Amino acid sequence: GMIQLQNPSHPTGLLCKANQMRLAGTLCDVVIMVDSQEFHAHRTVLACTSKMFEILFHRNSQHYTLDFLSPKTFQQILEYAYTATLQAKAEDLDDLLYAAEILEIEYLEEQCLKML
Ligand SMILES: [Mg+2]
Known part of the structure; x- marks a missing residue:
């Protein structure tokens, strides 16, 4: 017979370790510059969060500059x-x-739109 296991804590625990890695700068593979401020992060997390980053990362520069926002907003x-x-x-x-x-x-975009 077949067996099945589900862990509803995996998605969240996985993202938790990723954030812990980003804070220690471990296994980071991309640098995003915002107003001459460097941010080390993981291509996979950013690309899965934003279609803009998914497209942009096919350049493989490992380094990108953003001009549509301030470092504070990006950190946010x-x-x-x-x-x-x-x-x-x-x-x-x-x-x-x-x-x-x-x-x-x-x-x-949805929430900010409602809040305004
Ligand atoms: Mg700027």
Whole structure:
């Protein structure tokens, strides 16, 4: 007979380790520059979070500069991507919507749209 196992804590635990890796900078494979500020991250997490990054990463530069947002906004979207949670001042909502729109993060775009 067949056997089956399911762990509903895997997706979340997996993302948790990934964030822990990004904080220690372990196995990072891409550098995103934002206003002369370097961010080390994982292509896979970013590409699965944003269709914009999925497309962009087919260049294989391992290094990319973003001009549509400030390092603060990016750090804000990086945290969301790695923790599924975003913290931001009400005064940043516009900045986030503009970037979420370009990055195509449906959830951030939806929420920011409602909140405004
Ligand atoms: Mg800039």
